[PDB]
Design a protein around this ligand. Sequence first.
Ligand SMILES: O=C(N[C@@H]1Cc2ccccc2[C@H]1O)c1cc2cc(Cl)sc2[nH]1
Ligand SMILES: O=C(N[C@@H]1Cc2ccccc2[C@H]1O)c1cc2cc(Cl)sc2[nH]1
Ligand SMILES: *Cc1c(COP(=O)(O)O)cnc(C)c1O
Ligand SMILES: *Cc1c(COP(=O)(O)O)cnc(C)c1O
Lengths: 803, 803
Amino acid sequence: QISVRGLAGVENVTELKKNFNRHLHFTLVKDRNVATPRDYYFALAHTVRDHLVGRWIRTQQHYYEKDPKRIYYLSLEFYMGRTLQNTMVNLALENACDEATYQLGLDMEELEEIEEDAGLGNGGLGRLAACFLDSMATLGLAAYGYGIRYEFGIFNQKICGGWQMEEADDWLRYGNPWEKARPEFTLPVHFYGRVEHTSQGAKWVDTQVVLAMPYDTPVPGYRNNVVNTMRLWSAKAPNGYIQAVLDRNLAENISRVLYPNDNFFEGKELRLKQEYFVVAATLQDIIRRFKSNFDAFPDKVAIQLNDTHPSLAIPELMRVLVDLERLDWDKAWEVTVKTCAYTNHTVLPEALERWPVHLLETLLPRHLQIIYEINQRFLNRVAAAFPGDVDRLRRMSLVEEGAVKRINMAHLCIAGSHAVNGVARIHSEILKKTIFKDFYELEPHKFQNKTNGITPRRWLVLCNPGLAEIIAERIGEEYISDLDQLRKLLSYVDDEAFIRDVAKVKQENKLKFAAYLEREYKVHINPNSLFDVQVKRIHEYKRQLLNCLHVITLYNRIKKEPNKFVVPRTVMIGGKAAPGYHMAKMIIKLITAIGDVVNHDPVVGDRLRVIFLENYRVSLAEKVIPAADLSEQISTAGTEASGTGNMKFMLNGALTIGTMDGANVEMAEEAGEENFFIFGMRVEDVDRLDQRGYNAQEYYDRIPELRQIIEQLSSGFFSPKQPDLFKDIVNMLMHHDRFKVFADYEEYVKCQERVSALYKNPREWTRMVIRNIATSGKFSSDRTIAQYAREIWGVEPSRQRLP
Amino acid sequence: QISVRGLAGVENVTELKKNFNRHLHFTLVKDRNVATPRDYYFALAHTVRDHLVGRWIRTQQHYYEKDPKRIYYLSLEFYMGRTLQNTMVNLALENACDEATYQLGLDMEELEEIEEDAGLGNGGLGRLAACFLDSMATLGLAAYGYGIRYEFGIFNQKICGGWQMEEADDWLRYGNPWEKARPEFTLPVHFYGRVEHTSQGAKWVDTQVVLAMPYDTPVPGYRNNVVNTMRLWSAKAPNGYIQAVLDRNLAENISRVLYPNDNFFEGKELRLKQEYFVVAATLQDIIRRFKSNFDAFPDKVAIQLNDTHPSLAIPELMRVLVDLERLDWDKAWEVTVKTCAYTNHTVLPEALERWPVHLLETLLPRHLQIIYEINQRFLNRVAAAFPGDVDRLRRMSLVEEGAVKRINMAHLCIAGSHAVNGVARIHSEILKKTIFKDFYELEPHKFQNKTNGITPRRWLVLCNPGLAEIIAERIGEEYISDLDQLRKLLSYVDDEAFIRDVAKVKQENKLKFAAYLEREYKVHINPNSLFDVQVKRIHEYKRQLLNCLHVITLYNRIKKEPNKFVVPRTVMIGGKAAPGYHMAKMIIKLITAIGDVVNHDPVVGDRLRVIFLENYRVSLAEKVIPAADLSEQISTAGTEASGTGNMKFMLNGALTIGTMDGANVEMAEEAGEENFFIFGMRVEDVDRLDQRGYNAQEYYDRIPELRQIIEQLSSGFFSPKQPDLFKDIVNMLMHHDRFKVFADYEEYVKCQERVSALYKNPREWTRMVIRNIATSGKFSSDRTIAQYAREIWGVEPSRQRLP
Ligand SMILES: O=C(N[C@@H]1Cc2ccccc2[C@H]1O)c1cc2cc(Cl)sc2[nH]1
Ligand SMILES: O=C(N[C@@H]1Cc2ccccc2[C@H]1O)c1cc2cc(Cl)sc2[nH]1
Ligand SMILES: *Cc1c(COP(=O)(O)O)cnc(C)c1O
Ligand SMILES: *Cc1c(COP(=O)(O)O)cnc(C)c1O
C-alpha cells in the first residue's frame, strides 16, 4: 500500500511468479515439497537479477559508443551490505515482488533476512565507497569501483560472558548470485624479483607471479536504467608433488581476509601485497580499455585514491609508462599527476601508512627506485621555491629518517596528485593550516574540500519506507534523487497531521526493532522509553567511555533519590573492536558489566536499561537507526574527520547530542544550532589544554559525582568476582587519556538533562525533529559526487534515463 | 545423418536455439559480439542440463515411493571424463543440438573440446566406478556413488626435454555446470580426541571437527528417463586473528588433491584422513535416509567397497550402531556383515594397505578399539574351526607383528563382509587358491568372481559413432543396452559390404586422430601405417620396457637389411607415471630418446616412427582407441588382475597382442584363440622360473639381437650427450627384474612378425576384426552390474523406462 514502492501490475506479477517457479525448478533443482527457506530466497534473487542484465549490457555498450571520460574509484574496502532490496528499489520492482511472493504464500521480508551482508569494509571509509558507487550510477557517470574480493569480510562478532569473540565471516559459503566471474579478463601480478638494464632501459625480472581473476557486480542507478560495475579481484596460483599443490594456498592467501584495523597502521607484509595486488591488476585493466599517444590519457581517465591504501598506483603508473610504453620520465609524470587524485580520511598519526624501505626494496624493488626519483625531483621543486629552507625539505620529503627508514605514503600521494581533499569543511581547513601546511604553501591550488554524504536510497527509502511515504504524500517523489527538496518540509512545522504522522512512524519503527531483539536474542526492551543510541567502531577517540560515565551517573542519581521522576531510557551501544586493540575490548566488557548491575536492580526496574548490540554491520544499521530517538556523536573536538553515521540519524528522525567536530558542525549550520544538542570543548579549547598540559586529577578533585564513579570502577562495584578487572581503564583515564574524557563530563551531563527536558514535551520534540529532517538535504552523496565530478574529475553529471 | 544420434525435430531444434540464446544472455551476460568460445560451450551445457532436471526430481521421488533396497558404491575415485556428449547421447539430443548449433553458426565438436575432464581417478579402478554408475542407471537400480570432490584431479602431464613434468589439474577454475551444491545436507566429521566411559558405554570426545559439504552430479541412464546421483564431499572449516583465518586451509586440505599412486601404498596421514572423511559423512547420510529396528537395515542397504580404500566403513558402522544407537555388539555385527561387500583389484604386495597402529590410535582411537575387538572374535572363530593351527591364526590376524605393528585392511574387509570378489576369472581363482586361501577354507561361500566390464555408451556410441552406425544398419539399436546381440555380426564375416564398411570406418578414425596430432602438437604421422598402441599407467608390471625392446629390434633389423620390405608402423605409447616413481619416469625418457634416433634416421624415413602421447586421460582414450589397429596388453602373466583398456580396444576394431593374463584369457575364450595374438609365459611357467631362480644373464648370453640392444643402451647410443643416462634401467633388467622382461622377448618378437604378416592381407585382417567385435558382448558393464545385483546385493535389474 505504500506508493513509493511502485506499481504491482497484473502482467508483471504473473510473470514474476512464473520466473520464480522456473528458477526454483531449473536453478535450485527443487519442488515446493522439499524447498528450503534459503532455496526460496535464491529463487527470488535470480528472478530479480534477470531484470538487471539487459540494462547492464546496454549501459556498457552506451559508454563505448559515447566514449566519455571514465572514472576509476580505487579502494581496499567496499562496505556494501545486502543487494536484493536495493536492486528492487532502484528498478521499481519492490511492490510487484512483494505481491508475487505473497500470492505464492511467502513473506518477502523473511526471505530478505537470509542474504549475507557483503561486509567488505571496516566502517566509515568503506561505507563511503559503497554510497559513492550508488550516487555515480544515479548521476549517469561512466564509473567503475575497483577492489579485492575477500573470501572473509569483517569478522562476525559474538558476545560471550560480556566479552567480544571473533568468528570468520564465511559470506560466500552458499554462493553469491550478485557476482559474475570474468575468466577472459584474468591478469598476472608480479612480486619480488630484481631490476636489470637492457639496450632500452630498466627491466623487472625473476618475479613470482600471482593471477588476478576479476568478479563483476552490477550497480543500479535510481530508476534511470543505468547499471555500472564494481570489479573485485581474487587471487589464484599460476599453474614433493603433494606439498607443491597444497602450497598454492600461500599465493591465494592474498585475497583471503579483510584486515580489521579501522584507524591504525600495523605494517604487515601481507597487507602491502593486498595493496599492490589491487593496484597492478586495476591499472592493467585501465590501460587496455584506454587502448581499445598517452597525451590524451588524463582526458579519458581519472583515478581516485580512497586514502593512501592504493597509493602505489602512482609509482605503478610511472613504471608502466616509462619501462613498458617507453615514454620519457617528464612526459610520464605530467600524465600521472593529471590522472590521479587523493582523498584523506583522518589526522590521527598512528593511522598514517609509513612503510619500511627494506620491505619495499625486497617486495617491489623497481617501485622503490621510482619513489626515490620522484622524491629527488619533488624536493628540487621545493628547494627552488623556498631557497635555503632546509627544515622544510626534511618535513616534506617522501623519505622519513630514523632507526628504520620509511616511505610516508601521504607525502607520495600529494606529490603525485593534481587534487587533495579532506572529507568535511573543518578537516579540509586543518589540512591546509597545520597537517599539510608546507604542501599547501607550495601548491595551494591542489587543496580542496568534499564534505561526505550518504545515499538516500539505502538510508531512507529502503530502511524507512514509512518516513519516505509521509514525505512523498506532501512533496512528491522528486526528493529521492534531489534531496535538497526536503527543505519544503519546513512549511509543515505547525501542520497537525504531519506532526502526528512523523511521531507515528518513529513509534512503528521502535516497535519493529523491539520485536527483532525479542525474536533473535530474547531481549525485552521498554517500548515507552527514549532510545539512546551510539553505534560506530569502538575507539578511544569516539569516547564510548564518556557515554559509560553518563549511564552510571543516571544510575547513581536514581539510587540517591528513588522517588524523583526521570524520563525512561534504553541506552544502546554497539560496534566492533579490532582483535588486537586491548583497551577497546575492555570498553566492550565495561558496557556489559554496567548492564549486569543496572538491568537487575529492582529500585531501577524499567526506568533505565543499558544493552550492547551484537554484530553491528550495514544490515543492523538499517534496522536500529530508523528506531533511534537520540544520536550520540561525542568524539573529542578535532578527532573525527567527518563522520557519516551522524548523517544517517538526522535523515531518519533522531535528534543529535554532539561536539563541534567533523560534519557535526555543518549539520548544525544547516538546521540551526537551536535544533542541535551541542556541548563540550571546541578545537580551540582542546589546543589550550594541550599547551598547559591535561591534568585529569583536577577534574576528579573538583567533581564529587565523578569521584563516586571512579571509586566504583576501582573498588570492584562493577566486577565483584574480579575487583581489579577495570584497573587499566581507571589508570588510562587518570594518567594517560589522550582524549580528555573528564574535561567534557560536566557539560555532557548537563546537555543530557536538556535532552530529557525536551522529551517530556512530545509535540516540541517532534517539531525539532521536523526541522532536522527538513535540513538534511546537503548530506546526500549525490551532492558530494556532483562536486567530485565538476571540481576534480572534469565531468558533468546527468540524471537522464536510458531507454 | 547418422540415425543412432537421434531425431532433429523442428520444434525441438527451434526450442534449443531459443534456450541457448536465453542462457547466453541471462546466465553468461553476453551478446553475440563479445561472446567467447567458452561462453558458447557454457550456453550449450546449461541448455542440455535443463533437460535433466524433471527426470532427476521424478526419479528420486519414485525411489522414495517404491522404497527399493538402495545401493551405495563407495570409492576414493570416480574417473568420469567429460559430461556434455554423454548427457546428449543418453537423452537422445545429439542430432538436435548439432543442428541447432549449426543453424547458429557454431561447430558443436569445437564447443565439446572446451570442457575439462573430471579426472578424479588414476586408472582402471577409478574408471570402473564411472562405468558402473552408468550401467546402474541404465538398469534402473536405486544406486548412489559416494566419493570426494577433489579440487585438483590427476595431474596434467607435460613432456619437456623428453621428461614428464607435473602441473596442477585446476578443473573447476571456470565453474562446473554439472554439479549442484547441497547446503542443507552438510555434516560434521570428527578427528583425533579420546575415548571415555559414561553410565551408557563408550563416548568419543574432545575431537577436532571438519565439515563435509556434498555436491550432487546427475547420472543419466540410456533412454529410460532414469537419472541417479553421484554425491562427492568437499571439506570446510567449521566457524592471532589473521593467522587463525588462514589456518582454516589446513582442515580444508583434506579434499585438495587426488593422490597419484596407482598401485602403491605410501602410508600418508593425509590419505588416511581422506578415507575416513568419505566414510564418516557417507554413513551418516545412509543412516538418516534409512530412518526417513536395525534388523531390516541390510534389507534396505548395500555398501560396496571399491578396494580397501573405504574399509573404515566396517568399524565406523559398528561405532554408530553400538555407541550411538546402543545396539548390542553381536546384533550390530550381524547387521554390518550383511550390509558390506568388498572388491579386490590387485595381488601385488606393495599395493596392500597396512596402517601403523600408532597412527590409527592417535587419529581414530575408538576405531582402533573396535578393530581389536573384531580381531579377537574373528580369531576365536578360526581357533574353533581349526583347533591347534597356531600359524593359521598368525596368518589370518587383522594385526601384523613387526618393528612397526600394523592393521591389514584387506583382512578387515574379508572379516566384515558377506561377499569378497576378484575382477576376472583367473584373479578370483588365485584369491581362493593362494592369496586368501585360509579365509576361503573358513568361509568358502563368501568368495565370488565378477569379471570387469566397460559401458558401450561412452566406449562405442560416443567415441565411435561411425562403427555404431554400420552395426545398427544391420542389426538395429537394441544392442546398445544388450551388447551380446553383437554375436549376430558373425553372420557377416563373408559379407562384402560389411567388410568394406568396417575398414572404411577404421581409416576415417585414423585420419581424424592424425588431424588432432597435427592441430594440437604439430606432429605428423604416416596415415598408411599400422597404428600400434600401448596406453595405460606406466608400471614395470605392464612392461612398456618389453615394447621398447621390440621397437629397437625393428630399427636394428631395418639397418641390417635396408632393402627388405617391412609393414610401416606408427608405434604410440602413452600414460602417466607416479611423481615419486623413478623407474617409471626413466621409462618415459627412454621412449622419447628412442624416438629421437629412430624418427630422424633417413634410412628409416616413414617406415617406422615411435611417439609418446602426452597427457593420457579419459577424453584422449576416446580419441586414440577408435584409431588403433593393434592393442598392446603385455603384462607378465599373473600381474594384471583384469584390465579394462583391453576391452575398449576389442570393441572398437583393433586386434590384440597379449599374454594369458587377467581378462585377456576370457577375451580369447570368447573370440577363439585363433583370433588373438597370444604369446609368452603362462602363470605356470612364471612360477617354475621362480622356483629355480630367474637369471636374466642366460637370455642375454643366448640371444644375439638382445645383446646388441643392451649394449646400445649401456654405451650411450640412445643418450650421446649423457652416455650413462640409462644405467639404472640396464642394471634392473640384468640383475633385479621382478617381471621377467627378457624371458618373453623371443616369443614377443616372433608374435609381432605374425601381426605384420596378417596386416599385409587387408581382407583377412578385417575378417579377424569382425570376429573380435562380434564377440566383445560379454565385456559390457551391464552384464557385470546385473551379476553384482543378483549375486551380491539381492536386487533385480530393469531396463523399463519411466514416463
Ligand atoms: O554467476 C553467474 N553465472 C554463472 C555462469 C556459470 C558458468 C558455469 C557454471 C554456472 C554458471 C552460472 O552460475 C551470473 C549471472 C549473472 C547475471 C547478473 Cl546481473 S550477475 C550474474 N552472475
Ligand atoms: O549449480 C547449480 N545452481 C546454482 C544455485 C545457485 C545459488 C547461488 C548462486 C548461483 C547458483 C546457481 O549457479 C545447478 C543447477 C543444476 C541443475 C542440474 Cl541437472 S546440475 C545443477 N547445478
Ligand atoms: C555508517 C557506518 C559507519 C560509520 O559511522 P560513524 O558513526 O560515522 O563512524 C560504520 N559502520 C557501519 C555499519 C555504518 O553503516
Ligand atoms: C580404461 C582406462 C585405464 C585402464 O586401462 P588398462 O590398460 O586396463 O590399465 C586407465 N586410464 C584411462 C584414461 C582409461 O580410460
